[PDB]
Amino acid sequence: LKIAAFNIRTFGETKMSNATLASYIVRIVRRYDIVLIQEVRDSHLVAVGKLLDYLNQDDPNTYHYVVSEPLGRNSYKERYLFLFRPNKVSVLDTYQYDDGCESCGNDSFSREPAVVKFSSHSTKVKEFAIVALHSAPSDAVAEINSLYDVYLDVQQKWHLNDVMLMGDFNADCSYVTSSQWSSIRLRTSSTFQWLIPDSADTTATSTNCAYDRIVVAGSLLQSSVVPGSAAPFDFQAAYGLSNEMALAISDHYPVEVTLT
């Protein structure tokens, strides 16, 4: 089971209308049994529709979807999108983190985390959740720290300890400095194991930042991770791109992991 999280800079109609860039996005998505796409700026879901049109142009059930409404503290809004192969896993339930009350999810998060419960037959973990988060760069420390509370929420609602938290956490450089790690419960609690290390470069840009992450909780899930399989996926190297072309795809690499 190959799983990934991928901030696609302003993924939207303009981008998916461009045959070349669509082409690369499709090829990239095709790598994965489950993939989280972030920064979806797609007001009427047209871009989500095109991508799915491509992913399913042969077999209509190659990929299924879970998509959120537009989300964001203010007028700037994004969606979370989960794409998954129904032949490789199944979606049991999904919800949006809300902190027990309607607008209350916006109290911790600019983009209230989408949470998906999956069933997986081909791995040691039979059931796990994935919590998506694209944090607000300026509030990254609090938002990653708040993820600890999301985990408690999941545990309580689904009586389930196997939880993967992932996405563009903005977890590095000027937004999370090394001295601030001691204040993120998600990092200091032994319940969580951090698969993309601080040293990883997950930006397609000049910066050296471990912005995008994959954290796993629960012995079963943890013990299902293929050792050494978690890495950013540098698609500029992979596809032999100029940097200009890489950047037109996104300013982040996907981060990926493999479960067994």
Place this chain on the structure above:
Amino acid sequence: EQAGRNALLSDISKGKKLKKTVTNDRSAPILD
């Protein structure tokens, strides 16, 4: 041709007070 048509047409001329109603108007353009 019905019975009581003229009285109907007379009542449409007199007009009628109608009741305050908040419309759930979802026709506005979605601007992004």
Place this chain on the structure above:
Amino acid sequence: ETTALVCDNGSGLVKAGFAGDDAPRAVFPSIVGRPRHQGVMVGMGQKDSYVGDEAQSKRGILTLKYPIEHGIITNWDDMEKIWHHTFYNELRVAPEEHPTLLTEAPLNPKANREKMTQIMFETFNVPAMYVAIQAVLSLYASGRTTGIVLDSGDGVTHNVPIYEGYALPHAIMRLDLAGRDLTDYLMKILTERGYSFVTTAEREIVRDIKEKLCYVALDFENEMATAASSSSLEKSYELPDGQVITIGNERFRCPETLFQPSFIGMESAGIHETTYNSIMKCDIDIRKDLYANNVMSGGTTMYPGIADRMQKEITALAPSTMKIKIIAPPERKYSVWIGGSILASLSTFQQMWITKQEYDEAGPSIVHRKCF
């Protein structure tokens, strides 16, 4: 107390609510979508189909259908989905216990009126229903029973001469140009000056600029001259991303199309000329009353200035001394609905419903005699 429903089906918008009310409880897009792919919205279960506002906002993962073209219903399975959504989701009521007034376009074919009736009785099981002609209802809403309506919505524009409550089929004019063509033409002329509108949101934005900044010039050629020699008519308009664009003569060239359809390649007479041609196809006696009672209804008559322009255009056409009066009520976007709410809550109307009992005996073709 048993309240009647009023439902005005349009090419672009459904307007629905309760007789006796000053306005519809619900206005949403006349659209039905079935998902092109398998998946769910977060927190939700899987859905076979969406209607109205939800379909519009998720269109990109759907296949949409507009069951109503130029005001006429052409797709029954889908119209059925829309009326269902209307009762159960929008108005939150049980059809089997409300009389329901429905509207139809002018010149609606008989078979159409019958299928409408049949569905109401045999599918939704209403206690009683009625069908009225839209132009007529918006005449009614303005407190009158003789006159001429100009109804201009999203797909279609009619001139409907009415006499003592009855539309005059023989003199009705239909012009195949309305809100949508107007939106497209603004989009065309905004582009011609270098702007770009190709995303779905970006097309939605053109409509917004139309509805908020457009108007009809009292004299098109003087307006052109003014805009050519001063910024006095320029208007800033602010996009989501906050940057600003300027809108000059496009503001009034867009709606001018209603008077000069050649602006978009059509060979039609304009709405002023069709209004006049319709009156002139009528009885000599009734013409004075048509001229003094020119009512305007529908979203596409909302343009600031349009009544004044019509006023002037008709005077130039008509006999030198004819009394002319254009009635352009502020609530006119929803006059059809409003006249329906009046008609269906009036005491003296309570006998004119077609009942389940009558339909059972006579059948769907009873809708012609009983909806005179």
